């Protein structure tokens, strides 16, 4: 019983559903071919991802998917987020259609590009910093549209055929959480900044697991006592320094997403 949004409705007969990408409890995501997602060249095919409900699903589940769709509409478009492309709402099940990033999530993209042993891999320093910069730009955008992510991590960043970073799942993990989130259930833009520092560490370990070894119970005590992760091998001091600023206990002493963009920009500018 959903209204027809002229800005977003896409013809159900021009979406060819394909292979499942993932299945939750009461919903799923499938790869699809869409024809005419570019209104200009309307016969062109493109590959998209489609979120939908499973048959085993309640009115609540439907309310949640509608909420995610509407929130994505309101936030609007950016190069560094997974964008809404279209919806199918009429005469059949709810489909929410989004960009499909060819190279999967950033953790897997990094781990698969780990070079053997001590050897050089295809990911240069400037490419790594560029990954971080792009994430920061996406987060600065979401922040300007009043979106707090709450689960920023390399697994929730996707990578396109052209190696563009796109933040996923912004319109719906203790090692990624700020203290105030851990202990006080408080999530702000500044708690997302803490997570971004953890993400930075992931990037510069080529997809390593945070607080390596350290059992998930010693973490809170480590943090309370002023401990943080050590500088990863080959990570320059400047980038470690940024990680450490994001992990200040006091939210107000962490950098803003605007300052992280500017810092990472200075680094990329200095690299010839
Ligand atoms: C694009 C081709 C493809 O198969 N890509 C692929 C393959 C694997 Cl094995 C893993 C991944 Cl992560 C991908 N890429 C991919 N891109 C986009 C996806 O969209 C899911 C999705 C997101 Cl991220 C979203 O965040 C804003 C919202 C919605 O719906 C509202 C969805 Cl469906 C999934 N996988």
GROMACS .gro file of C-alpha atoms and ligand atoms in nm:
model
  306
    1UNK     CA    1   0.000   0.000   0.000
    2UNK     CA    2   0.297   0.230  -0.074
    3UNK     CA    3   0.287   0.562  -0.259
    4UNK     CA    4   0.443   0.606  -0.600
    5UNK     CA    5   0.737   0.844  -0.583
    6UNK     CA    6   0.788   0.994  -0.929
    7UNK     CA    7   1.148   1.090  -0.841
    8UNK     CA    8   1.252   0.731  -0.768
    9UNK     CA    9   1.015   0.470  -0.913
   10UNK     CA   10   1.187   0.241  -1.166
   11UNK     CA   11   0.998  -0.010  -1.392
   12UNK     CA   12   0.986  -0.357  -1.237
   13UNK     CA   13   1.002  -0.507  -1.589
   14UNK     CA   14   1.342  -0.349  -1.654
   15UNK     CA   15   1.515  -0.515  -1.355
   16UNK     CA   16   1.644  -0.870  -1.412
   17UNK     CA   17   1.713  -1.029  -1.077
   18UNK     CA   18   2.026  -1.248  -1.056
   19UNK     CA   19   2.247  -1.424  -0.799
   20UNK     CA   20   2.187  -1.370  -0.423
   21UNK     CA   21   2.456  -1.155  -0.256
   22UNK     CA   22   2.346  -1.215   0.103
   23UNK     CA   23   2.058  -1.333   0.324
   24UNK     CA   24   1.960  -1.199   0.668
   25UNK     CA   25   1.682  -1.340   0.887
   26UNK     CA   26   1.379  -1.182   0.716
   27UNK     CA   27   1.536  -1.015   0.403
   28UNK     CA   28   1.793  -1.044   0.124
   29UNK     CA   29   2.015  -0.876  -0.132
   30UNK     CA   30   2.052  -0.993  -0.491
   31UNK     CA   31   2.262  -0.883  -0.779
   32UNK     CA   32   2.052  -0.765  -1.074
   33UNK     CA   33   2.080  -0.624  -1.423
   34UNK     CA   34   1.891  -0.298  -1.465
   35UNK     CA   35   1.805  -0.150  -1.806
   36UNK     CA   36   1.785   0.226  -1.836
   37UNK     CA   37   1.925   0.334  -1.496
   38UNK     CA   38   2.078   0.608  -1.712
   39UNK     CA   39   1.768   0.792  -1.841
   40UNK     CA   40   1.990   0.938  -2.118
   41UNK     CA   41   2.097   0.599  -2.267
   42UNK     CA   42   1.783   0.400  -2.167
   43UNK     CA   43   1.872   0.063  -2.324
   44UNK     CA   44   2.210   0.039  -2.143
   45UNK     CA   45   2.241  -0.239  -1.884
   46UNK     CA   46   2.411  -0.192  -1.552
   47UNK     CA   47   2.472  -0.423  -1.255
   48UNK     CA   48   2.303  -0.310  -0.931
   49UNK     CA   49   2.220  -0.457  -0.593
   50UNK     CA   50   1.859  -0.496  -0.482
   51UNK     CA   51   1.740  -0.521  -0.122
   52UNK     CA   52   1.405  -0.693  -0.060
   53UNK     CA   53   1.210  -0.887   0.206
   54UNK     CA   54   1.190  -1.266   0.236
   55UNK     CA   55   0.843  -1.425   0.250
   56UNK     CA   56   0.904  -1.493   0.623
   57UNK     CA   57   0.880  -1.124   0.715
   58UNK     CA   58   0.668  -0.903   0.940
   59UNK     CA   59   0.513  -0.560   0.898
   60UNK     CA   60   0.800  -0.439   1.121
   61UNK     CA   61   1.057  -0.565   0.869
   62UNK     CA   62   0.872  -0.382   0.595
   63UNK     CA   63   0.870  -0.062   0.806
   64UNK     CA   64   1.249  -0.089   0.848
   65UNK     CA   65   1.321  -0.128   0.475
   66UNK     CA   66   1.089   0.166   0.393
   67UNK     CA   67   1.272   0.370   0.656
   68UNK     CA   68   1.610   0.283   0.504
   69UNK     CA   69   1.477   0.378   0.153
   70UNK     CA   70   1.334   0.712   0.271
   71UNK     CA   71   1.644   0.797   0.471
   72UNK     CA   72   1.858   0.728   0.163
   73UNK     CA   73   1.638   0.956  -0.047
   74UNK     CA   74   1.668   1.238   0.201
   75UNK     CA   75   2.044   1.210   0.251
   76UNK     CA   76   2.104   1.240  -0.124
   77UNK     CA   77   2.394   1.145  -0.354
   78UNK     CA   78   2.770   1.141  -0.298
   79UNK     CA   79   3.068   0.983  -0.475
   80UNK     CA   80   3.180   0.810  -0.153
   81UNK     CA   81   2.861   0.641  -0.038
   82UNK     CA   82   2.658   0.355  -0.184
   83UNK     CA   83   2.384   0.552  -0.359
   84UNK     CA   84   2.013   0.480  -0.400
   85UNK     CA   85   1.933   0.431  -0.768
   86UNK     CA   86   1.567   0.345  -0.781
   87UNK     CA   87   1.279   0.166  -0.612
   88UNK     CA   88   0.998  -0.069  -0.716
   89UNK     CA   89   0.696  -0.008  -0.496
   90UNK     CA   90   0.385  -0.079  -0.706
   91UNK     CA   91   0.211  -0.409  -0.785
   92UNK     CA   92   0.464  -0.648  -0.634
   93UNK     CA   93   0.721  -0.662  -0.357
   94UNK     CA   94   0.931  -0.368  -0.234
   95UNK     CA   95   1.267  -0.350  -0.412
   96UNK     CA   96   1.526  -0.094  -0.307
   97UNK     CA   97   1.793  -0.061  -0.575
   98UNK     CA   98   2.146   0.061  -0.500
   99UNK     CA   99   2.491   0.081  -0.656
  100UNK     CA  100   2.676  -0.253  -0.674
  101UNK     CA  101   3.046  -0.220  -0.597
  102UNK     CA  102   3.240  -0.468  -0.813
  103UNK     CA  103   3.531  -0.533  -0.577
  104UNK     CA  104   3.346  -0.610  -0.254
  105UNK     CA  105   3.430  -0.473   0.089
  106UNK     CA  106   3.744  -0.289   0.179
  107UNK     CA  107   3.873  -0.544   0.433
  108UNK     CA  108   3.858  -0.824   0.173
  109UNK     CA  109   3.993  -0.594  -0.098
  110UNK     CA  110   4.293  -0.519   0.126
  111UNK     CA  111   4.349  -0.878   0.246
  112UNK     CA  112   4.345  -1.015  -0.110
  113UNK     CA  113   4.612  -0.764  -0.206
  114UNK     CA  114   4.851  -0.869   0.072
  115UNK     CA  115   5.182  -0.940  -0.096
  116UNK     CA  116   5.373  -1.260  -0.009
  117UNK     CA  117   5.584  -1.213   0.308
  118UNK     CA  118   5.823  -0.916   0.299
  119UNK     CA  119   5.764  -0.836  -0.073
  120UNK     CA  120   5.605  -0.522  -0.231
  121UNK     CA  121   5.232  -0.549  -0.309
  122UNK     CA  122   5.029  -0.353  -0.560
  123UNK     CA  123   4.894  -0.110  -0.290
  124UNK     CA  124   5.125   0.190  -0.263
  125UNK     CA  125   5.119   0.434   0.024
  126UNK     CA  126   4.940   0.697  -0.188
  127UNK     CA  127   4.667   0.446  -0.274
  128UNK     CA  128   4.621   0.356   0.096
  129UNK     CA  129   4.599   0.721   0.203
  130UNK     CA  130   4.361   0.776  -0.087
  131UNK     CA  131   4.132   0.502   0.052
  132UNK     CA  132   4.134   0.676   0.390
  133UNK     CA  133   4.076   1.024   0.234
  134UNK     CA  134   3.777   0.896   0.037
  135UNK     CA  135   3.622   0.739   0.345
  136UNK     CA  136   3.670   1.064   0.536
  137UNK     CA  137   3.496   1.260   0.250
  138UNK     CA  138   3.202   1.020   0.255
  139UNK     CA  139   3.175   1.054   0.632
  140UNK     CA  140   3.202   1.434   0.611
  141UNK     CA  141   2.916   1.428   0.365
  142UNK     CA  142   2.697   1.199   0.576
  143UNK     CA  143   2.774   1.412   0.876
  144UNK     CA  144   2.656   1.727   0.686
  145UNK     CA  145   2.327   1.541   0.618
  146UNK     CA  146   2.295   1.463   0.991
  147UNK     CA  147   2.371   1.096   0.947
  148UNK     CA  148   2.561   0.920   1.229
  149UNK     CA  149   2.686   0.586   1.099
  150UNK     CA  150   2.743   0.394   1.426
  151UNK     CA  151   2.926   0.100   1.258
  152UNK     CA  152   3.209   0.246   1.052
  153UNK     CA  153   3.469  -0.027   0.979
  154UNK     CA  154   3.650  -0.160   0.670
  155UNK     CA  155   3.384  -0.431   0.627
  156UNK     CA  156   3.123  -0.153   0.582
  157UNK     CA  157   3.321   0.023   0.310
  158UNK     CA  158   3.278  -0.113  -0.045
  159UNK     CA  159   3.514  -0.074  -0.344
  160UNK     CA  160   3.414  -0.006  -0.702
  161UNK     CA  161   3.573  -0.131  -1.025
  162UNK     CA  162   3.760   0.203  -1.032
  163UNK     CA  163   3.885   0.171  -0.665
  164UNK     CA  164   3.646   0.439  -0.533
  165UNK     CA  165   3.547   0.388  -0.167
  166UNK     CA  166   3.173   0.382  -0.089
  167UNK     CA  167   3.035   0.376   0.268
  168UNK     CA  168   2.769   0.109   0.307
  169UNK     CA  169   2.472   0.068   0.537
  170UNK     CA  170   2.453   0.426   0.661
  171UNK     CA  171   2.071   0.434   0.652
  172UNK     CA  172   1.993   0.136   0.881
  173UNK     CA  173   3.177  -0.459   1.684
  174UNK     CA  174   3.310  -0.365   2.026
  175UNK     CA  175   3.663  -0.319   1.893
  176UNK     CA  176   3.541  -0.029   1.668
  177UNK     CA  177   3.337   0.150   1.935
  178UNK     CA  178   3.423   0.470   2.116
  179UNK     CA  179   3.428   0.453   2.496
  180UNK     CA  180   3.111   0.665   2.534
  181UNK     CA  181   2.939   0.419   2.301
  182UNK     CA  182   3.077   0.115   2.486
  183UNK     CA  183   2.996   0.230   2.834
  184UNK     CA  184   2.718   0.495   2.796
  185UNK     CA  185   2.534   0.373   2.476
  186UNK     CA  186   2.600   0.730   2.337
  187UNK     CA  187   2.671   0.754   1.960
  188UNK     CA  188   2.768   1.089   1.802
  189UNK     CA  189   2.970   1.208   1.500
  190UNK     CA  190   3.267   1.206   1.736
  191UNK     CA  191   3.216   0.840   1.819
  192UNK     CA  192   3.222   0.774   1.444
  193UNK     CA  193   3.559   0.952   1.442
  194UNK     CA  194   3.693   0.698   1.689
  195UNK     CA  195   3.579   0.424   1.458
  196UNK     CA  196   3.744   0.593   1.162
  197UNK     CA  197   4.075   0.576   1.354
  198UNK     CA  198   4.023   0.200   1.387
  199UNK     CA  199   3.946   0.185   1.018
  200UNK     CA  200   4.272   0.373   0.943
  201UNK     CA  201   4.459   0.106   1.137
  202UNK     CA  202   4.278  -0.158   0.934
  203UNK     CA  203   4.388   0.011   0.613
  204UNK     CA  204   4.751   0.028   0.711
  205UNK     CA  205   4.758  -0.338   0.827
  206UNK     CA  206   4.600  -0.433   0.494
  207UNK     CA  207   4.291  -0.556   0.668
  208UNK     CA  208   4.421  -0.674   1.003
  209UNK     CA  209   4.206  -0.754   1.307
  210UNK     CA  210   4.215  -0.479   1.568
  211UNK     CA  211   4.374  -0.538   1.912
  212UNK     CA  212   4.537  -0.852   1.774
  213UNK     CA  213   4.512  -1.140   2.021
  214UNK     CA  214   4.387  -0.927   2.307
  215UNK     CA  215   4.077  -1.103   2.440
  216UNK     CA  216   3.756  -0.898   2.400
  217UNK     CA  217   3.738  -0.867   2.784
  218UNK     CA  218   4.076  -0.698   2.846
  219UNK     CA  219   3.988  -0.424   2.592
  220UNK     CA  220   3.783  -0.199   2.818
  221UNK     CA  221   4.045  -0.209   3.088
  222UNK     CA  222   4.323  -0.136   2.831
  223UNK     CA  223   4.133   0.173   2.713
  224UNK     CA  224   4.056   0.300   3.059
  225UNK     CA  225   4.423   0.278   3.144
  226UNK     CA  226   4.530   0.485   2.837
  227UNK     CA  227   4.644   0.199   2.615
  228UNK     CA  228   4.582   0.199   2.239
  229UNK     CA  229   4.701  -0.006   1.942
  230UNK     CA  230   5.065   0.026   1.847
  231UNK     CA  231   5.190   0.168   1.520
  232UNK     CA  232   5.159  -0.096   1.250
  233UNK     CA  233   5.472  -0.193   1.054
  234UNK     CA  234   5.566   0.060   0.787
  235UNK     CA  235   5.291   0.304   0.895
  236UNK     CA  236   5.442   0.650   0.890
  237UNK     CA  237   5.437   0.854   1.212
  238UNK     CA  238   5.202   1.112   1.059
  239UNK     CA  239   4.930   0.856   0.996
  240UNK     CA  240   4.978   0.683   1.331
  241UNK     CA  241   4.950   1.031   1.487
  242UNK     CA  242   4.609   1.077   1.323
  243UNK     CA  243   4.491   0.737   1.449
  244UNK     CA  244   4.594   0.837   1.798
  245UNK     CA  245   4.405   1.167   1.782
  246UNK     CA  246   4.087   0.982   1.681
  247UNK     CA  247   4.137   0.766   1.993
  248UNK     CA  248   4.148   1.046   2.249
  249UNK     CA  249   3.917   0.954   2.537
  250UNK     CA  250   3.747   1.293   2.530
  251UNK     CA  251   3.515   1.319   2.218
  252UNK     CA  252   3.584   1.691   2.192
  253UNK     CA  253   3.956   1.631   2.161
  254UNK     CA  254   3.917   1.402   1.861
  255UNK     CA  255   3.944   1.560   1.519
  256UNK     CA  256   3.631   1.644   1.315
  257UNK     CA  257   3.568   1.473   0.980
  258UNK     CA  258   3.654   1.808   0.824
  259UNK     CA  259   3.994   1.806   0.996
  260UNK     CA  260   4.056   1.446   0.893
  261UNK     CA  261   3.980   1.533   0.529
  262UNK     CA  262   4.222   1.826   0.552
  263UNK     CA  263   4.497   1.622   0.718
  264UNK     CA  264   4.472   1.339   0.469
  265UNK     CA  265   4.461   1.595   0.185
  266UNK     CA  266   4.792   1.748   0.311
  267UNK     CA  267   4.948   1.401   0.299
  268UNK     CA  268   4.834   1.325  -0.055
  269UNK     CA  269   4.946   1.671  -0.168
  270UNK     CA  270   5.290   1.615  -0.020
  271UNK     CA  271   5.333   1.287  -0.210
  272UNK     CA  272   5.470   1.445  -0.531
  273LIG     C1  273   2.837  -0.531  -0.806
  273LIG     C2  274   2.877  -0.675  -0.835
  273LIG     C3  275   2.895  -0.764  -0.713
  273LIG     O1  276   2.870  -0.883  -0.716
  273LIG     N1  277   2.952  -0.705  -0.605
  273LIG     C4  278   2.983  -0.766  -0.481
  273LIG     C5  279   3.026  -0.898  -0.467
  273LIG     C6  280   3.060  -0.947  -0.342
  273LIG    CL1  281   3.109  -1.114  -0.323
  273LIG     C7  282   3.053  -0.869  -0.228
  273LIG     C8  283   3.015  -0.736  -0.241
  273LIG    CL2  284   3.012  -0.636  -0.100
  273LIG     C9  285   2.981  -0.685  -0.366
  273LIG     N2  286   2.934  -0.552  -0.376
  273LIG    C10  287   2.817  -0.501  -0.328
  273LIG     N3  288   2.791  -0.374  -0.361
  273LIG    C11  289   2.680  -0.320  -0.311
  273LIG    C12  290   2.597  -0.391  -0.227
  273LIG     O2  291   2.485  -0.324  -0.183
  273LIG    C13  292   2.419  -0.369  -0.062
  273LIG    C14  293   2.343  -0.253  -0.001
  273LIG    C15  294   2.408  -0.148   0.063
  273LIG    CL3  295   2.581  -0.153   0.076
  273LIG    C16  296   2.340  -0.037   0.112
  273LIG     O3  297   2.411   0.060   0.176
  273LIG    C17  298   2.380   0.197   0.150
  273LIG    C18  299   2.202  -0.033   0.102
  273LIG    C19  300   2.134  -0.137   0.041
  273LIG     O4  301   1.999  -0.134   0.027
  273LIG    C20  302   1.926  -0.028   0.088
  273LIG    C21  303   2.205  -0.246  -0.010
  273LIG    CL4  304   2.123  -0.370  -0.099
  273LIG    C22  305   2.631  -0.522  -0.197
  273LIG     N4  306   2.740  -0.579  -0.248
   0.00000   0.00000   0.00000
